[PDB]
Design an enzyme around this catalytic site. Structure first.
Site, PDB file in Angstrom:
ATOM      1  N   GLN A  19       0.819  -1.201   0.000  1.00 35.00           N
ATOM      2  CA  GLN A  19       0.000   0.000   0.000  1.00 35.00           C
ATOM      3  C   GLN A  19       0.856   1.253   0.000  1.00 35.00           C
ATOM      4  O   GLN A  19       0.355   2.345  -0.279  1.00 35.00           O
ATOM      5  CB  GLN A  19      -0.978   0.031   1.168  1.00 35.00           C
ATOM      6  CG  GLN A  19      -0.322  -0.106   2.514  1.00 35.00           C
ATOM      7  CD  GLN A  19      -1.326  -0.114   3.627  1.00 35.00           C
ATOM      8  OE1 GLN A  19      -1.750  -1.185   4.085  1.00 35.00           O
ATOM      9  NE2 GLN A  19      -1.743   1.085   4.062  1.00 35.00           N
ATOM     10  N   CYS A  25      -5.158   0.627   3.486  1.00 26.31           N
ATOM     11  CA  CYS A  25      -5.359  -0.766   3.854  1.00 26.31           C
ATOM     12  C   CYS A  25      -6.803  -1.193   3.597  1.00 26.31           C
ATOM     13  O   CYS A  25      -7.042  -2.274   3.046  1.00 26.31           O
ATOM     14  CB  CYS A  25      -5.017  -0.984   5.319  1.00 26.31           C
ATOM     15  SG  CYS A  25      -5.817   0.170   6.477  1.00 26.31           S
ATOM     16  N   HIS A 163      -6.482  -0.964  11.456  1.00 25.93           N
ATOM     17  CA  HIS A 163      -5.932  -1.525  10.231  1.00 25.93           C
ATOM     18  C   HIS A 163      -6.822  -2.629   9.668  1.00 25.93           C
ATOM     19  O   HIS A 163      -7.221  -3.542  10.398  1.00 25.93           O
ATOM     20  CB  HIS A 163      -4.590  -2.111  10.534  1.00 25.93           C
ATOM     21  CG  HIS A 163      -3.777  -2.393   9.326  1.00 25.93           C
ATOM     22  ND1 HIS A 163      -3.492  -1.430   8.384  1.00 25.93           N
ATOM     23  CD2 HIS A 163      -3.141  -3.520   8.923  1.00 25.93           C
ATOM     24  CE1 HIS A 163      -2.718  -1.954   7.444  1.00 25.93           C
ATOM     25  NE2 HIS A 163      -2.490  -3.222   7.748  1.00 25.93           N
ATOM     26  N   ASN A 185      -1.713  -9.257   4.935  1.00 23.18           N
ATOM     27  CA  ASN A 185      -1.563  -7.837   5.201  1.00 23.18           C
ATOM     28  C   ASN A 185      -1.076  -7.233   3.921  1.00 23.18           C
ATOM     29  O   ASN A 185      -0.788  -7.975   3.001  1.00 23.18           O
ATOM     30  CB  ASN A 185      -0.568  -7.654   6.323  1.00 23.18           C
ATOM     31  CG  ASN A 185      -0.392  -6.230   6.734  1.00 23.18           C
ATOM     32  OD1 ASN A 185      -1.329  -5.433   6.745  1.00 23.18           O
ATOM     33  ND2 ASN A 185       0.836  -5.899   7.099  1.00 23.18           N
TER      34      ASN A 185
END
Ligand code: V65
Length: 218
Positions: A19, A25, A163, A185
Site C-alpha cells: 500500500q 489498507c 488496520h 496484510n
C-alpha cells in the site's frame, strides 16, 4: 468446519501487495475479499483496482489515503455497478480524480454481509465463504516488526481497530493455545511470513479480529 483452512491453495488469493505510504489498507482488504468472491462465482482470479476505491468512493464515506471501511467499498461497487481491474487502473499511492471506466469493470457486488461479532462465526464464514475482510489492532511495535510464529500482543484491544486486512484461512501448530488465523496484510512481501501473519485465534478475540468482519455478496 475443517480444523485447518487455507484459501490460497484453492486459487482464491492474489499475490501480496504494497500500500506504500498511504492510508488505504481498507481498499486492499476489500479488493481481497472481492477477488476471492469473484473467483468463487467465476473461477477466474483477477486482481482489482484499489486506486479505483481510493479515488472514487468518497460518496460512500471513504477518505482516500486517510482511511475508509471495507463496508463502504463494498457499497461503492454496488452503487457504482463495477470496479476496474488493477491492470486497467493501477495503484498510484496518492489520491487522484475519479477515472473509473465502466468498460474495464471486472467485478460487481450485490451488497455485503456483516459477520456476528464472534470467532466461532468468523470461523464458519472463513470455512464456508472464502477470504474475509477484517479490522485488527496493528498499533504496536510488535506488529510493525513481525517476522514469524503466532502473533500475541498483551496490549492489543478487542474493539479499537486501526488496520484492515484479509483472513484467508486458519490452522493450529504442534503447546496449549496453538491455533491461529491466516492473515494477508498489505505491506509488501518483505514484511513477516511472505507478507502474511499468523494471528492468535480463540484467545478472546485477540486484536479484535472477529470484531468488524464482512464480505461482499456477488
Ligand atoms: C488503513 N491504512 C487505515 N489508516 C487509517 N489512518 C491512516 C492515516 O491517518 C488517519 C488514520 N485509519 C484507518 N481506519 C480508521 C478509519 C478511518 C477513517 C474511516 Cl472513514 C474509517 C476508519 C480503519 C478502521 C477500520 C478498519 C481499517 C482501519 N485505516
Amino acid at each position: 468446519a475443517p480444523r485447518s483452512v487455507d484459501w490460497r491453495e484453492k486459487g482464491y488469493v492474489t499475490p501480496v501487495k504494497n500500500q506504500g505510504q498511504c492510508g488505504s489498507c481498507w481498499a486492499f482488504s476489500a479488493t481481497g475479499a472481492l477477488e476471492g468472491q469473484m473467483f468463487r462465482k467465476t473461477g477466474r482470479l483477477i486482481s482489482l483496482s484499489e486506486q479505483n476505491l481510493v479515488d472514487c468512493s468518497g460518496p460512500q464515506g471513504n477518505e482516500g489515503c486517510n482511511g475508509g471501511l471495507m463496508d463502504y467499498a463494498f457499497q461503492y461497487v454496488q452503487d457504482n455497478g463495477g470496479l476496474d481491474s488493477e491492470e486497467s487502473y493501477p495503484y498510484e499511492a496518492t489520491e487522484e480524480s475519479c477515472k473509473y471506466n465502466p468498460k474495464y469493470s471486472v467485478a460487481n457486488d450485490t451488497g455485503f454481509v456483516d459477520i456476528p461479532k464472534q470467532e466461532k462465526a468468523l470461523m464458519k464464514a472463513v470455512a464456508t465463504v472464502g477470504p474475509i475482510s477484517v479490522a485488527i489492532d496493528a498499533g504496536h511495535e510488535s506488529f510493525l516488526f513481525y517476522k514469524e510464529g503466532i502473533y500475541f500482543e498483551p496490549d492489543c484491544s478487542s474493539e479499537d481497530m486501526d488496520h484492515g486486512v484479509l483472513v484467508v484461512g486458519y490452522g493450529f501448530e504442534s503447546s496449549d493455545n496453538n491455533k491461529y488465523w491466516l492473515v494477508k496484510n498489505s505491506w509488501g512481501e518483505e514484511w513477516g511470513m511472505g507478507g502474511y501473519v499468523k494471528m492468535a485465534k480463540d484467545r478472546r478475540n485477540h486484536c479484535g479480529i472477529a470484531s468488524a468482519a464482512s464480505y461482499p455478496t456477488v
